[PDB]
Amino acid sequence: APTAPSIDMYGSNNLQFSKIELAMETTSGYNDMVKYHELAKIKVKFNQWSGTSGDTYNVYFDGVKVATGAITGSQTTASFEYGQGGLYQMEIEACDATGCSKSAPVEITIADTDGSHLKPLTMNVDPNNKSYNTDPSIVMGTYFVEWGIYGRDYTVDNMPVDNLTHILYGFIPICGPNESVKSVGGNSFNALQTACRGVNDYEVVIHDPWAAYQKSFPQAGHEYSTPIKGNYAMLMALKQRNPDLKIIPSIGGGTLSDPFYDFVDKKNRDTFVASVKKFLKTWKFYDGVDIDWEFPGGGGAAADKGDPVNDGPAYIALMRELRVMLDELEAETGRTYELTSAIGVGYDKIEDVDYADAVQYMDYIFAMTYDFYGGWNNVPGHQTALYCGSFMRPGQCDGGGVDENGEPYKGPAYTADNGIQLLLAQGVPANKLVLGTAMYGRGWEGVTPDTLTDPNDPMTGTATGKLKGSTAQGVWEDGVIDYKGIKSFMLGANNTGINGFEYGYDAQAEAPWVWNRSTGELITFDDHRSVLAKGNYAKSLGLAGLFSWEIDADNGDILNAMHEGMAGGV
């Protein structure tokens, strides 16, 4: 017999609540910005402008009582806690000693990081991506990068999810030594320094919280009060659409690897592994963890770091300790968690780790069968070839021979096959190895006909420096160009060459190129034919499947060719 409560929507934060508390309007240290709570704090103001207020209120969700408290005037704030994500029909009743009066029902939101409060994501995929029916048991993986939402304008809803079994989210940094990040320039180091304020060394943080959970995406139905936004809310909604899709954070990468060189100290491993556990309990759409340590024993971005004696055993013990933690999470959640790793495959990288030992703890190894050659020097070669190319010298392929100075090769050439063979030779099972495809080229300038030793092979020439180009042509950094830019501005619709470029293919290597004779611009990449070769290769050997870097730089062609190659292998 009190007046029925009316809910004050705007005074109740629009009925948007959350188990995760996220700072939306600042950029600060990770522990300040991100706090996960077992119970969402709910706060609901309601009014009873006319008649009497009564003396007690009860809150209902879906007809079930979840809170009570005192009414003592014409305006009440109900605060209480609720543990479960989702959308519920809320009613609030006011009672006095003679009876109760319920508000009409209204939808309350409680966000959780599994995406339980979200609709399946609405997609906007380039239709050049085709439909396939590839055995769901074969891995088809790709990397999606956090920074691709800026100039590259490639957002979660753009991924051809149905053609993917695995999404690797690049990249998650680690607080601590990160000089390599500083040397890259731009805002990347400053952002990391900010994320790590008030955070212990060796713990993971979100690099760019604006990209991750702050930016409002209209295509996803984000609004001012949406408690989770950015790439991560879209990934949560993506899981709603494709529940068997694995989405896995990728920790480190080429530039963010400096902290791994201190994993020789188990205290630092303990810290890291703990932080990875809390990360996965905070961000529940994620299905495991991927370790991109580039690289045990060194020879990566960090010129002053790398220990060929101890890095490999640190890596193995890291994998065991991650697997122990993941087993805890599988026990507590009833879910399956995956442990994976992307690795260098030059002989000199592989030799510093006993992967037969490491892989017993692991689901997959992502074999980085790319970046074999590039604009970091002036020696052209195939950046992502399966086999040894025609430009290689005698004894260069297997490492038997001597270079153009008479100096012995130190080991087998950088090719996919040499890398996979070396891993198989250590005792890694083929069904745990994933072969990598390139959705980008690397290239040079100044490789003109007078530099060649074989007039029909630009891979026999000498360059002057790195390919240069504009972002409109897909060149986001010197020496590197998106596949989709190669296709638009060098190959042309027919794959025969435009704007001064010709196409060529090294059949021995299984690697294409596009070469401009007068500028001497040369670009090495993966195309439809080299990718069919790689799918046939993976199939012959019983490899787990294929993966790619990076999804934003494809137009549909590379991923299509990945599915076609895995069907068509003879």
What residues act catalytically? 294
Is the Cβ–Cβ distance between 517 and 500 less than 8 Å? yes
Q: Which stretch binds ligand DEQ (CB under 6 A): 84-92, 125-133, 421-429, 510-518?
A: 125-133
C-beta of 187 vs 518, nearer to ligand DEQ: 187
Q: Which stretch binds ligand DEQ (CB under 6 A): 12-20, 105-113, 161-169, 537-545?
A: 161-169
Q: Is 208 in the site for ligand DEQ (CB under 6 A)?
A: yes
Q: Is 162 in the site for ligand DEQ (CB under 6 A)?
A: yes
C-beta of 61 vs 147, nearer to ligand DEQ: 147
Going by C-beta distance under 8 Å and a sequence separation of 6 or more, which residues neighbour residue 422? 345, 347, 350, 351, 412
Q: Which of 76, 103, 113, 129 binds ligand DEQ (CB under 6 A)?
A: 129
Token pair listed for 12: 């109740």
Tell me which long-range contacts 332-339 makes (C-beta under 8 A, separation of at least 24).
335/287, 336/287, 337/280, 337/287, 337/288, 337/289, 338/246, 338/248, 338/287, 338/288, 338/289, 338/363, 338/364, 339/288, 339/289, 339/291, 339/363
Q: Is 492 in the site for ligand DEQ (CB under 6 A)?
A: no
C-beta of 299 vs 313, nearer to ligand DEQ: 299
Is the Cβ–Cβ distance between 221 and 157 less than 8 Å? no
Q: Which of 125, 325, 430, 567 binds ligand DEQ (CB under 6 A)?
A: 125
Q: Is 221 in the site for ligand DEQ (CB under 6 A)?
A: no
C-beta of 38 vs 153, nearer to ligand DEQ: 153
Chain centroid to CA 493: how far? 30
Token pair listed for 561: 């060719």
Going by C-beta distance under 8 Å and a sequence separation of 6 or more, which residues neighbour residue 6? 46, 47, 48, 49, 103
CB of 476 to ligand DEQ, least distance (A): 6
Residue 352's nearest CA partner among 266, 412, 426, 291 is: 426
Cα angle at 134 between 132 and 140, to 5 degrees?
100
CB of 239 to ligand DEQ, least distance (A): 14
Q: How far is 254 from 188, CA to CA, in rounded Å?
A: 13
| DSSP-derived secondary structure letter, 50 | S
Q: Which stretch binds ligand DEQ (CB under 6 A): 207-215, 316-324, 350-358, 482-490?
A: 207-215
Beta-strand pair 545-549/139-145: parallel
Is the Cβ–Cβ distance between 262 and 311 less than 8 Å? no
User: Backbone dihedral region of 299: left (phi > 0), alpha (psi from -120 to 50 degrees) or beta?
Assistant: left
- Breaks (C–N over 2.5 Å) after residues, the chain: none
Q: In Å, how far are 17, 19, 112, 248, 508 from 85, measured between CA atoms?
A: 9, 7, 5, 22, 56
How many residues bind ligand DEQ (CB under 6 A)? The answer is: 28
Q: Which of 48, 109, 163, 250 binds ligand DEQ (CB under 6 A)?
A: 163
CB of 11 to ligand DEQ, least distance (A): 28
Q: Is 187 in the site for ligand DEQ (CB under 6 A)?
A: yes
Task: Write the interaction track for ligand DEQ spanning residues 274-313; mark x where CB under 6 A is met and - where it is not.
Answer: -------------------------xxx-x----------
Q: Which stretch binds ligand DEQ (CB under 6 A): 156-164, 402-410, 429-437, 514-522?
A: 156-164
Considering only residues 243 to 262 of the shown chain, the ones binding ligand DEQ according to CB under 6 A are 254
C-beta of 26 vs 336, nearer to ligand DEQ: 26
CB of 432 to ligand DEQ, least distance (A): 24
C-beta of 204 vs 326, nearer to ligand DEQ: 204
Considering only residues 368 to 427 of the shown chain, the ones binding ligand DEQ according to CB under 6 A are 371, 374, 376
Strand segments (E) across 62-98: 64-70, 75-82, 86-96
CB of 327 to ligand DEQ, least distance (A): 32
CB of 553 to ligand DEQ, least distance (A): 12
Q: Which stretch binds ligand DEQ (CB under 6 A): 107-115, 159-167, 268-276, 542-550?
A: 159-167
Q: How far is 89 from 67, CA to CA, in rounded Å?
A: 14
CA pseudo-torsion sign 304, 305, 307, 310: positive
CB of 160 to ligand DEQ, least distance (A): 3
C-beta of 54 vs 173, nearer to ligand DEQ: 173
φ/ψ of 287, rounded to 5, equals -105, 15
Chain centroid to CA 425: how far? 29
C-beta of 163 vs 275, nearer to ligand DEQ: 163
- List contacts with ligand DEQ (CB under 6 A): 27, 123, 125, 127, 129-131, 147, 150, 160-163, 187-188, 191, 207-208, 210, 254, 299-301, 303, 371, 374, 376, 476
